[PDB]
Design a protein around this ligand. Sequence first.
Ligand SMILES: N[C@@H](CCC(=O)N[C@@H](CS)C(=O)NCC(=O)O)C(=O)O
Length: 672
Amino acid sequence: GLLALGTPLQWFESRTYNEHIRDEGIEQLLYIFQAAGKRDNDPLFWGDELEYMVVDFDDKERNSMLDVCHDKILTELNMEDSSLCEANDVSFHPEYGRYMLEATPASPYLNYVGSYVEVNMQKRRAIAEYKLSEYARQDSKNNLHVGSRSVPLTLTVFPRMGCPDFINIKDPWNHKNAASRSLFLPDEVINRHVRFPNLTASIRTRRGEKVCMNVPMYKDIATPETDDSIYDRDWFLPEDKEAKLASKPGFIYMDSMGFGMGCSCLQVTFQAPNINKARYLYDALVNFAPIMLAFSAAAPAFKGWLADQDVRWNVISGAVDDRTPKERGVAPLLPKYNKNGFGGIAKDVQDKVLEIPKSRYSSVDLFLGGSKFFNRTYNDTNVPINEKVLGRLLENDKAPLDYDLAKHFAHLYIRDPVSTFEELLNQDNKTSSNHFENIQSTNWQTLRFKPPTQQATPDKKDSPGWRVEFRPFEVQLLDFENAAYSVLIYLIVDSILTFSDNINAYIHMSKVWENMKIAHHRDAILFEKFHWKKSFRNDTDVETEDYSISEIFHNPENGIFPQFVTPILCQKGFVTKDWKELKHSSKHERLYYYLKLISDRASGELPTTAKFFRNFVLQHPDYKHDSKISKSINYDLLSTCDRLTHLDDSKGELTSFLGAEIAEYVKKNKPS
Ligand SMILES: N[C@@H](CCC(=O)N[C@@H](CS)C(=O)NCC(=O)O)C(=O)O
């Protein structure tokens, strides 16, 4: 569906409600516990979300741009084409990008659904393409977008974001971009739902400096010493003068929310049998996140530069980092504007400000605990909390919480609201969870623990229960890939839920955070090592050693395959002892190829999308050995991507990306 309409409050106007919003949200959370805390036997309903970028291929000029003009597609698919969607069990939603689409199945899958995930993804893609060709026909007859061809591509990152000629709008700088005030992204990159410009404005104002994300540059033989795309400008104060102080030699400089939230990923949500199992699951997935981040890398470039990392994560992390310099333990870049480092924080609350170590978009901070292997000492990192929120979740007449669970909520609640409508200031806290969602939904982490609504009382069997979202996977080009990774997480989750008495996955959170930095490094999948529990079938044992991705997927003692995937496939009867027996299964041949794709990438036999893009740029005739992605490199790159997305081996590129065996396999067999 669409986000329903409202008037956003600008930050200066909204900040005087921070405490009102937090208070009432907590009350709502208490009502939700009171009402749904006792749900049980909830079934394993689950679903993926994909995010797409509509690219306008201008073949005559050899230029691929983001198409910021067919954005009505999201309204049409939710009005007069909504019946197309439902008949097809798909659903479409807006995302940050004006050029982005988000789409999910219309109903959750129930337990194992084989190839249906891929089938449902393809339908999402076909309905998008269909709508695009309808616009192409209308456009033609009104002489609009001549020589343009729009295609939706599931790219993690647009390699030419905020570079010249990257959006299909003539002369986008002939007016100002008051929302982001970016040097590089005109505000037309932003979806027109008021929420998105608003979040963009509030975070910038609250911070009192532009968001800033410095990404190490790939260091090739002729690479400039600095990011020579930086220029000086005079539209905005303090912002146009920040760049020279915020940038750093040998780093791509990014300065706007759309560089981050203008990226795409694959997200998967699961419903646990009840809250306790949801905690158990969420805790167990914590260290899988850095690992699947590295394993799925798809983002080797930003703002036109080959980067020295392969994932989006830290970029999205900085793109919505509302921490004032005081909050980050640092001097403002421009002290006469950012007054004492408190940016836009109210004068009457500066005394209560905290040094906070991590962006509101960052890895899980705390295990929730509550299961037999948990021990509070595994939460061994710096996690500031809202003491007031802790107190009240601890001591209240609706649903008093255990201290570990109270601490998680208390940590999420150290942030202010960054987007609030005036209509909605006063809600009925027994029926509404909108204020809790304000803060829940703007703490973006590697997982999300999702309480349900106050309507989900245990007798409502069909309501959503307690859920866990697995958020780190970079999105891939092919529906085949994205289905594989969706099923991978599915099997891992099912393994975790079926074997809960036996699987102890606890490790010290600090190792996980370290894992999150390693997962960024260029070619991490191919040689880096990550702290990984040495055994799972083992009460009290929280020892790790350092293992490559290959070992992490394949070690008998503690690998993803022999300890998660294979065991659940045995017990469901898909195989008698090994995941590879599936090559010969009648019912399950496709599951073998998903797993083989996963196994082969985890061991370096086949390349990540990030790798394949890095190679392509490096081996391009026009590449100038300087790390720059030209209009023309970007065009062929995305043309390749387009063919790949479509299983088109006419140039041997699918065979080069997937290898012969999988390439033939997917060309010769549609999902059913
Ligand atoms: N594109 C993001 C995931 C999607 C996301 O976090 N979207 C933001 C956009 S502001 C959001 O909060 N979406 C839900 C909403 O806007 O209500 C990623 O790769 O992590």
